[PDB]
Design an enzyme around this catalytic site. Structure first.
Site, PDB file in Angstrom:
ATOM      1  N   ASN B  93       7.005  -7.390   1.687  1.00 47.85           N
ATOM      2  CA  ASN B  93       5.781  -6.612   1.529  1.00 47.85           C
ATOM      3  C   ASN B  93       5.592  -6.190   0.081  1.00 47.85           C
ATOM      4  OD1 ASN B  93       3.700  -4.739   1.439  1.00 47.85           O
ATOM      5  ND2 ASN B  93       4.507  -3.418   3.053  1.00 47.85           N
ATOM      6  N   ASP B 192       1.189  -8.639   0.017  1.00 41.93           N
ATOM      7  CA  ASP B 192       1.936  -8.479   1.256  1.00 41.93           C
ATOM      8  C   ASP B 192       1.617  -9.614   2.242  1.00 41.93           C
ATOM      9  OD1 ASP B 192       3.304  -7.566   3.475  1.00 41.93           O
ATOM     10  OD2 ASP B 192       1.830  -6.008   3.919  1.00 41.93           O
ATOM     11  N   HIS B 348      -6.678 -12.347   5.596  1.00 47.38           N
ATOM     12  CA  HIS B 348      -5.799 -13.260   4.883  1.00 47.38           C
ATOM     13  C   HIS B 348      -6.048 -14.689   5.348  1.00 47.38           C
ATOM     14  CE1 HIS B 348      -2.939 -11.372   2.150  1.00 47.38           C
ATOM     15  NE2 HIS B 348      -2.920 -10.315   2.944  1.00 47.38           N
ATOM     16  N   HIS B 382      -5.859 -10.940  -0.650  1.00 50.03           N
ATOM     17  CA  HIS B 382      -6.229 -10.260  -1.899  1.00 50.03           C
ATOM     18  C   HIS B 382      -6.317 -11.310  -3.025  1.00 50.03           C
ATOM     19  CE1 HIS B 382      -5.540  -6.359  -0.030  1.00 50.03           C
ATOM     20  NE2 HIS B 382      -4.348  -6.777   0.362  1.00 50.03           N
ATOM     21  N   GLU B 407      -1.995  -8.943  -7.906  1.00 51.11           N
ATOM     22  CA  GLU B 407      -1.262  -7.875  -7.238  1.00 51.11           C
ATOM     23  C   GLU B 407       0.125  -7.750  -7.821  1.00 51.11           C
ATOM     24  OE1 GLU B 407      -1.432  -7.214  -2.968  1.00 51.11           O
ATOM     25  OE2 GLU B 407       0.192  -5.766  -3.100  1.00 51.11           O
ATOM     26  N   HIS B 409       2.260  -5.038  -6.941  1.00 52.43           N
ATOM     27  CA  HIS B 409       2.735  -3.911  -6.140  1.00 52.43           C
ATOM     28  C   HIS B 409       4.183  -3.468  -6.450  1.00 52.43           C
ATOM     29  CE1 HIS B 409       1.823  -1.853  -2.013  1.00 52.43           C
ATOM     30  NE2 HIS B 409       2.423  -1.028  -2.852  1.00 52.43           N
ATOM     31  N   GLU B 452      -3.505  -3.190  -5.489  1.00 49.35           N
ATOM     32  CA  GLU B 452      -2.206  -2.546  -5.660  1.00 49.35           C
ATOM     33  C   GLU B 452      -1.496  -2.999  -6.935  1.00 49.35           C
ATOM     34  OE1 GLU B 452      -0.787  -3.570  -1.565  1.00 49.35           O
ATOM     35  OE2 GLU B 452      -0.961  -1.423  -1.183  1.00 49.35           O
ATOM     36  N   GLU B 528      -9.217  -0.522   2.892  1.00 47.68           N
ATOM     37  CA  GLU B 528      -8.298  -0.720   4.021  1.00 47.68           C
ATOM     38  C   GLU B 528      -8.207   0.573   4.822  1.00 47.68           C
ATOM     39  OE1 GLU B 528      -5.460  -3.382   1.077  1.00 47.68           O
ATOM     40  OE2 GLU B 528      -4.423  -2.254   2.644  1.00 47.68           O
ATOM     41  N   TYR B 529      -8.294   0.455   6.144  1.00 48.04           N
ATOM     42  CA  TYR B 529      -8.126   1.584   7.044  1.00 48.04           C
ATOM     43  C   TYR B 529      -7.793   1.084   8.440  1.00 48.04           C
ATOM     44  CZ  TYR B 529     -12.625   1.165   9.666  1.00 48.04           C
ATOM     45  OH  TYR B 529     -13.656   0.779  10.512  1.00 48.04           O
ATOM     46  N   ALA B 530      -7.383   1.996   9.315  1.00 48.76           N
ATOM     47  CA  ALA B 530      -7.054   1.660  10.704  1.00 48.76           C
ATOM     48  C   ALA B 530      -6.055   0.494  10.821  1.00 48.76           C
ATOM     49  CB  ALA B 530      -8.337   1.381  11.509  1.00 48.76           C
ATOM     50  N   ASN B 588      13.655  -8.850   3.629  1.00 51.91           N
ATOM     51  CA  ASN B 588      12.376  -9.092   4.289  1.00 51.91           C
ATOM     52  C   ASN B 588      11.838  -7.792   4.858  1.00 51.91           C
ATOM     53  OD1 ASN B 588      12.938  -8.923   7.438  1.00 51.91           O
ATOM     54  ND2 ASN B 588      14.689  -9.951   6.487  1.00 51.91           N
ATOM     55  N   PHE B 592       6.129  -6.322   9.654  1.00 47.55           N
ATOM     56  CA  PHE B 592       5.015  -5.823   8.851  1.00 47.55           C
ATOM     57  C   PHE B 592       4.014  -6.904   8.449  1.00 47.55           C
ATOM     58  CE2 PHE B 592       4.994  -1.297   8.369  1.00 47.55           C
ATOM     59  CZ  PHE B 592       6.288  -0.901   8.717  1.00 47.55           C
ATOM     60  N   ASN B 595      -0.313  -7.392  11.414  1.00 50.61           N
ATOM     61  CA  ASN B 595      -1.187  -6.213  11.444  1.00 50.61           C
ATOM     62  C   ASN B 595      -2.590  -6.534  11.964  1.00 50.61           C
ATOM     63  OD1 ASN B 595      -0.182  -6.042   8.019  1.00 50.61           O
ATOM     64  ND2 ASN B 595       1.039  -5.267   9.729  1.00 50.61           N
TER      65      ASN B 595
HETATM   66  C1  LIG Z   1       4.185   2.046   1.645  1.00 52.57           C
HETATM   67  C2  LIG Z   1       4.031   0.612   2.148  1.00 52.57           C
HETATM   68  C3  LIG Z   1       4.079   0.545   3.673  1.00 52.57           C
HETATM   69  S1  LIG Z   1       2.582  -0.120   1.429  1.00 52.57           S
HETATM   70  C4  LIG Z   1       1.390  -0.705   2.600  1.00 52.57           C
HETATM   71  O1  LIG Z   1       1.984  -1.759   3.361  1.00 52.57           O
HETATM   72  C5  LIG Z   1       1.109  -2.282   4.356  1.00 52.57           C
HETATM   73  C6  LIG Z   1       1.941  -3.130   5.303  1.00 52.57           C
HETATM   74  O2  LIG Z   1       1.108  -3.898   6.176  1.00 52.57           O
HETATM   75  C7  LIG Z   1      -0.058  -3.009   3.673  1.00 52.57           C
HETATM   76  O3  LIG Z   1       0.392  -4.110   2.863  1.00 52.57           O
HETATM   77  C8  LIG Z   1      -0.802  -2.005   2.795  1.00 52.57           C
HETATM   78  O4  LIG Z   1      -1.789  -2.689   2.020  1.00 52.57           O
HETATM   79  C9  LIG Z   1       0.167  -1.272   1.863  1.00 52.57           C
HETATM   80  O5  LIG Z   1      -0.539  -0.240   1.183  1.00 52.57           O
HETATM   81 MG   LIG Z   2       0.983  -4.635  -1.552  1.00 50.65          MG
HETATM   82 NA    NA Z   3       1.404  -6.239   6.267  1.00 52.71          NA
END
Ligand SMILES: CC(C)S[C@@H]1O[C@H](CO)[C@H](O)[C@H](O)[C@H]1O
Ligand SMILES: [Mg+2]
Ligand code: NA
Ligand SMILES: CC(C)S[C@@H]1O[C@H](CO)[C@H](O)[C@H](O)[C@H]1O
Ligand SMILES: [Mg+2]
Ligand SMILES: [Mg+2]
Ligand code: NA
Ligand code: NA
Ligand code: NA
Ligand code: NA
EC number: 3.2.1.23
Lengths: 174, 1014, 211
Positions: B93, B192, B348, B382, B407, B409, B452, B528-530, B588, B592, B595
């Site tokens: 991620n 991610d 994605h 992204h 990105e 991050h 990010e 991004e939300y929900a 890994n 995650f 989603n």
């Molecule tokens: C603090 C982390 C969980 S960052 C968090 O991870 C998510 C995992 O699906 C997404 O990638 C979001 O974009 C990201 O902000």
């Molecule tokens: Mg990220």
């Molecule tokens: Na994710």
């Protein structure tokens, strides 16, 4: 390589291995010398007489020059503009470019100044620390070698280009 | 080439690469250009290439340049070589998959050697220019043609083009491409997602004439009421300038040409040195343009003809034109003068079989499903997408956020590269070449600077670049606190509706609060939300109530569309869904990568229906017998909509009807219901309305339901006392049991446990596991968060429940008595659940078994106020029977939870047992249905006011099993009946997100069940 | 950017400095051909950013300049905004593309006259008194170049200063320029003489315009 890759005809390559720019440094090892703005033993001037040979193009530079002083070369003052020494002519033009407008290309006949200096470095500089060379002004672009080995490349005639020589230097003459 | 490690130099992002530009095909016939038919000058090299894998580029044999390696295999291109099995895909991620040491990458750098032997006709080399286009190469590549080095390219998500004219020969040619997995570009590609590599988008050859259209930009501007437009087309050429050269831009509506302009080259004066002699700007008047929007995606066709004054065509290019204006005014984002409400999703490019290779079918499937579920917008999370995506969005009608492939991050801090001027060149190309490519697509309404990567000065520079170059679209960017100087839109990720999250430096304010911060004027739209990870979208309705109440809250993009799960195969060759770590990839981030609103194969999660319902375009109110319908369309009338209504008494249909909808955009319609006949019997009357689309569209089928709503009408409470029975249940006592007998029925209460341990109908056991209280759930992804065995997050719900001993609390008996009554037996029980001397829960029950065979269970639970609020308050048991169907009166048909039940309707539902289980790839508590008054399974009926799930999988197995494919159906059926069940949350999935009103904090709980046989 | 000692001396003797990026593309047609080209953004960015990194601590530097005579391109706007983010302590000026573009905080024309308009298409040079009060215009005006002191020149110099003193927002300018760019040459007797364009065989050349 170096002749392959015409970095001087690529606006995407404006430097190779150049260090980050920064405000004026002297690396004082004494607080009081820093305060009073007095000379620093860690900052050394290479404004001495160098060796210079003129060429009509980079392709005319012999490969032995990397390792040895050319016997044809003159000893000249540095810093200098080589036109002020008479090697070729200074050009005065206002708007019209001094070369054919064909970016990113420059003329095949491209006057080349081969400079060199044999110098010593204090033993203590080789044991510890970082030793860099700084060229405050090179017009208009340049490649650099230390002890026969390629170091890096620079553009922009009016700002300093800096290169780490720590991995390149040796005891005695460089 | 090996000398000069260009893949470790952010100062070198390409060598000999051609200028970026909008999609080209170099038609030599105007009509073919107009109709968008295939072009003979555009050849696809999407066939079988030769491929070989190496651990490092130093291991590539020099002979590969001149000749095919016999070791190599024959593989499909486009492809990711991880999907062919050459090495493993990595799921991480945030943490970079390589050591953080810019600009350097690992010495062990997987290298993919692609090659192709192909024909070129002489006609392509006699005159003009032959270029090769690689739409996608991950992450950097060197190119050779017929042995000779052509060039080099970075940025995985934009086309790289090279002139091959001097390299090719008529007849047999060989292309050699060395693809590097890791490069200095990888430092800017830390999205991610699965980290893969290869030539994963189209490869093509494009033939252009020497005198060519080299670029063209289409702009549309409008008067105040959009009744007049000027189409402005800037066209650039390469080749030798000549007085006889002309450009004609013509505009078409189907087969009707609406406007046309012809001019020679030579733009207006620009500065003291003149203008652009190699450019022309054509301007066409368009009266009453048909406007583009996601509601009605009206398109015109612009044909750009380069030709002689006398009329010989040199070449034509073309694009779809959508007439629309996007602007921010007075703090509102306007499309065609109207404030948008973004019903968005992040998407994605992911396929479970093909990795990150996109295809038309999957792309179309996605759009259809999105529009069918009331989405109107998509964010390219992204990176720039496959070029066909934009075309499809143009044509079906979806608003696009076009996002640069940047990105970072995993840097510390997040802006370490983006604030570094040495990284500006690399960043600049990822923004600039995107804009140059995509700027003619009407579907793109917003540019995004990436994702990010903190907020650095490079963002501010690139923000301003786009503002100069393209004033037609707002620029947004979330990094560094979502309201920086580099964004036109306040675009936070996972900011909550009402709750502030005041992180230092980058707080996420409540979105309602954020809008009115001193000096803040901008619109807010969540990028991004929900977070839809597993059993999620709890609290989704709360966002939409806010979006609708606050003008400047203009919506957001759900995270996200589709699970990034990949297919693996077992020893029997059976497929299963895999996530992080399932390929030996380490470190890994496990599940995650999943989603999505839909599974990888595009099957919906239950959450999708909640999104459809909340994103509805028709709002409803009921007053007496009058339904008020309000349209949330901004442009279209409701000319393919009818309202069905139905009144039912506890699931029994009583009356129905239909009324055409005739609602102007933003308008209202009143529908008066006819007099409804009174029901004789007791119960609740329910009104359900649905919006049906009688006609098929480009995106949906005939009869498509786009909106619905439900109301309670009249209730007649049951006052009739049930028919008195003549039988009276018999109590039998032993040291170990209370047994109750009535006819062919028997109940057994264990006096040592205090639970009903067995039930008989005739001679047959009904239970495999006794009926016991339950306070825990197999933890959801939202309960788990980012916790791990090696690094506990003490704040996660699962960890709070574990540390308090909720999962290992043992029932201790306090009371178990039996009394014989006039027409019943009463069993009274009391239990305590304790952990290390602390009493967590107390359960006091009565069971009343009367002469009619009904067992009334009254349950009263106390929960210690200082223990973490429990996941559920209810009972469970393992039934002996496996029945085919599940019948219930309650909320459905789909899985619904207290904070995700607005989509569900109250009615009589009947489903196969298997639909009562949701196959989440990471297994958890699932398949609950709330607001249930009656449940039927085989011979059993439960009545009351409860939530339930029912399946072949115990809560224990679900929490012990990390993948759905490893689940085995247990003997009988596990039934969980809850008086109360905690919310699921989902505002994010890395911190507690269940809202206070959905936490079980009341201290004392009461529920009652009637268990009987029908 | 100058020899580093120039800034030291300006700090110590007291002169206000405009520090200017080494970008001039005057000979392009049109003048912004390179500076509006994103492919030239990286090369241009280094010239601006490495100057700021070097000179940002010199008090004598009061204004940053994006270069000279390169028209107005999008690369200018990007680099304008870069400086404004990295160093809020100094205004950014740039004359190219009409002296009053989005890439300058100061209206900084070259050779705009006091009273007479020169309404060149696209890039007019308004009277400086009129320029200040154009509809919507609020910025200060300081000529980056004025009073071309070539040979027997500086006619009408007093007219600039009267204006500067009467109008608050006319805050002066920079004479063009300090010193003749003539070069020493020698005759057959070894006597030195002042040489200009053409005197070194250099052709094409612009003769005495270096002075
Ligand atoms: C603090 C982390 C969980 S960052 C968090 O991870 C998510 C995992 O699906 C997404 O990638 C979001 O974009 C990201 O902000
Ligand atoms: Mg990220
Ligand atoms: Na994710
Ligand atoms: C139209 C041309 C004369 S341009 C003119 O040339 C001058 C010559 O000294 C200076 O270089 C000025 O800066 C320049 O604008
Ligand atoms: Mg170069
Ligand atoms: Mg590189
Ligand atoms: Na709103
Ligand atoms: Na599990
Ligand atoms: Na003044
Ligand atoms: Na001059």
């Amino acid at each position: 390589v170096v002749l392959q890759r015409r970095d001087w005809e690529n606006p995407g390559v404006t430097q190779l291995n150049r260090l980050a720019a920064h405000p004026p440094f002297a690396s004082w090892r004494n607080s009081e010398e820093a305060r009073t703005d007095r000379p620093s033993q860690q900052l050394r001037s290479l404004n001495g007489e160098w060796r210079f040979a003129w060429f009509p193009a980079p392709e005319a530079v012999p490969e032995s020059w990397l390792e040895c002083d050319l016997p044809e070369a003159d000893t000249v003052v540095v810093p200098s503009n080589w036109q002020m020494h008479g090697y070729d002519a200074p050009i005065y033009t206002n708007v019209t470019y001094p070369i054919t407008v064909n970016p990113p290309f420059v003329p095949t006949e491209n006057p080349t100044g081969c400079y060199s200096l044999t110098f010593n470095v204090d033993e203590s500089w080789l044991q510890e620390g970082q030793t860099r060379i700084i060229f405050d002004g090179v017009n208009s672009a340049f490649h650099l070698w230390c002890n026969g080995r390629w170091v890096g490349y620079g553009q922009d005639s009016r700002l300093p280009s800096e290169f780490d020589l720590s991995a390149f230097l040796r005891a005695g003459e460089n | 080439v090996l000398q000069r490690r260009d893949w470790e130099n952010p100062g070198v992002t390409q060598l000999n690469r051609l200028a970026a530009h909008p999609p080209f095909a170099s038609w030599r016939n105007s009509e073919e250009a107009r109709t968008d038919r295939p072009s003979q000058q555009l050849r696809s090299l999407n066939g079988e290439w030769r491929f070989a894998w190496f651990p490092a580029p130093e291991a590539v044999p020099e002979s590969w340049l001149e000749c095919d390696l016999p070791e190599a295999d024959t593989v499909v291109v486009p492809s990711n070589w991880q999907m062919h099995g050459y090495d493993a895909p990595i799921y991480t991620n945030v943490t970079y998959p390589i050591t953080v040491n810019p600009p350097f990458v690992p010495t062990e750098n997987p290298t993919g050697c692609y090659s192709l032997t192909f024909n070129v006709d002489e006609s392509w080399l006699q005159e003009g220019q032959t270029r090769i286009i690689f739409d996608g190469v991950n992450s950097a590549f060197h190119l050779w043609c017929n042995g000779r080095w052509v060039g080099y390219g970075q940025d995985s998500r934009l086309p790289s083009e090279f002139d091959l004219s001097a390299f090719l020969r008529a007849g047999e040619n060989r292309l050699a491409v060395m693809v590097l997995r890791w490069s200095d570009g990888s430092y800017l590609e830390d999205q991610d997602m699965w980290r893969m590599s290869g030539i994963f988008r189209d490869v093509s050859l494009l033939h252009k004439p020497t005198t060519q259209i080299s670029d063209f930009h289409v702009a549309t501007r409008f008067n105040d009421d959009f009744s007049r437009a000027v189409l402005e087309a800037e066209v650039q050429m390469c080749g030798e300038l000549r007085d006889y050269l002309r450009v004609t831009v013509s505009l078409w509506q189907g087969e009707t040409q609406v406007a046309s302009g012809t001019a020679p080259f030579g733009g207006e004066i620009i500065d003291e040195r003149g203008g652009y002699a190699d450019r022309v700007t054509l301007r066409l008047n368009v009266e009453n343009p048909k406007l583009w929007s996601a509601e009605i995606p009206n398109l015109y066709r612009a044909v750009v003809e380069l030709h002689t004054a006398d009329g010989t065509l040199i070449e034509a290019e073309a694009c779809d034109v959508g007439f629309r204006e996007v602007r921010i005014e007075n703090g509102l984002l306007l499309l065609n003068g109207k404030p948008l409400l973004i019903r968005g999703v992040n998407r994605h490019e992911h396929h479970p079989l093909h990795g990150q290779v996109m295809d038309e079918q999957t792309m179309v499937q996605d759009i259809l499903l999105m529009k069918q579920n009331n989405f109107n917008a998509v964010r390219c999370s992204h990176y720039p997408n496959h070029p066909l995506w934009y075309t499809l969005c143009d044509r079906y009608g979806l608003y696009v956020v076009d996002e640069a492939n940047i990105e970072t991050h995993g840097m510390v801090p997040m802006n370490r590269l983006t604030d570094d001027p040495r990284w500006l060149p690399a960043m600049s190309e990822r923004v600039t070449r995107m804009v140059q490519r995509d700027r003619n697509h009407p579907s793109v309404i917003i540019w995004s600077l990436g994702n990010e990567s903190g907020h650095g000065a490079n963002h501010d520079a690139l923000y301003r670049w786009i503002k100069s170059v393209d004033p037609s679209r707002p620029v947004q960017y979330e990094g560094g606190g979502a309201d920086t100087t580099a964004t036109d839109i306040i675009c936070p990720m996972y900011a909550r509706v009402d709750e502030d999250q005041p992180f230092p430096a980058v707080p996420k304010w409540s979105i309602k609060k954020w809008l009115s911060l001193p000096g803040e004027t901008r619109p807010l739209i969540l990028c991004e939300y929900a977070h839809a990870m597993g059993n999620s979208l709890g609290g989704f309705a709360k966002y939409w109530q806010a979006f609708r109440q606050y003008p400047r809250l203009q919506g957001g993009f759900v995270w996200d569309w589709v699970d990034q799960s990949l297919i693996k195969y077992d020893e029997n060759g059976n497929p299963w869904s895999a996530y992080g770590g399932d390929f030996g990839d380490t470190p890994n981030d496990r599940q995650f990568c999943m989603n999505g609103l839909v599974f990888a194969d595009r099957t919906p999660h239950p959450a999708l229906t909640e999104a459809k319902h909340q994103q509805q375009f028709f709002q409803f109110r009921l007053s007496g017998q009058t339904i008020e319908v309000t349209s949330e369309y901004l442009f279209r009338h409701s000319d393919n909509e009818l309202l069905h209504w139905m009144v039912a008494l506890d699931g029994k249909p009583l009356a129905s009807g239909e009324v055409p909808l005739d609602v102007a955009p933003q308008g209202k319609q009143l529908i008066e219901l006819p007099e409804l006949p009174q029901p004789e019997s007791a119960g609740q009357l329910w009104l359900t309305v649905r919006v049906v689309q009688p006609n098929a569209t480009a995106w949906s089928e005939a009869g498509h339901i786009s909106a619905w709503q439900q109301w309670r009408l009249a209730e007649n409470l049951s006052v009739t006392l049930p028919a008195a029975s003549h039988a009276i249940p018999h109590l039998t006592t032993s040291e170990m049991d209370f047994c109750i007998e009535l006819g062919n029925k028997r109940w057994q209460f264990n006096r040592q446990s205090g639970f009903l341990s067995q039930m008989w109908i005739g001679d047959k056991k009904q239970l495999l596991t006794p009926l016991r209280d339950q306070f825990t759930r197999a933890p959801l992804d939202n309960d788990i968060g980012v916790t791990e065995a090696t690094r506990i997050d003490p704040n996660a719900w699962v960890e709070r429940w574990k540390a308090a001993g909720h999962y290992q609390a043992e029932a201790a008996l306090l009371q178990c008595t039996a009394d014989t009554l006039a027409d019943a037996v009463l069993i009274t029980t009391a239990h305590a659940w304790q952990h290390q001397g602390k009493t967590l829960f107390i359960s006091r029950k009565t069971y009343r078994i009367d002469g009619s065979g009904q067992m009334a269970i009254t349950v009263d639970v106390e929960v210690a106020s200082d223990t973490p609020h429990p996941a559920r308050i209810g009972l469970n048991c393992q039934l002996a029977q496996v029945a085919e169907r599940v019948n219930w009166l309650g909320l459905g048909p789909q899985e619904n939870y207290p904070d995700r039940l607005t989509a569900a309707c109250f009615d009589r539902w009947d489903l196969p047992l298997s639909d009562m289980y949701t196959p989440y790839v990471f297994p958890s508590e699932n398949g609950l249905r709330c607001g249930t008054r009656e449940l039927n399974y085989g011979p059993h009926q439960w009545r009351g006011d409860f939530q339930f799930n029912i399946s072949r999988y115990s809560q224990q197995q679900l929490m012990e099993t990390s993948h759905r494919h490893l689940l085995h159906a247990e003997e009988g059926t596990w039934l969980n009946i809850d008086g109360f069940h905690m919310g699921i949350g989902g505002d994010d999935s890395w911190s507690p997100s269940v809202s206070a009103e959905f936490q079980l904090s009341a201290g004392r709980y009461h529920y009652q069940l009637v268990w009987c046989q029908k």
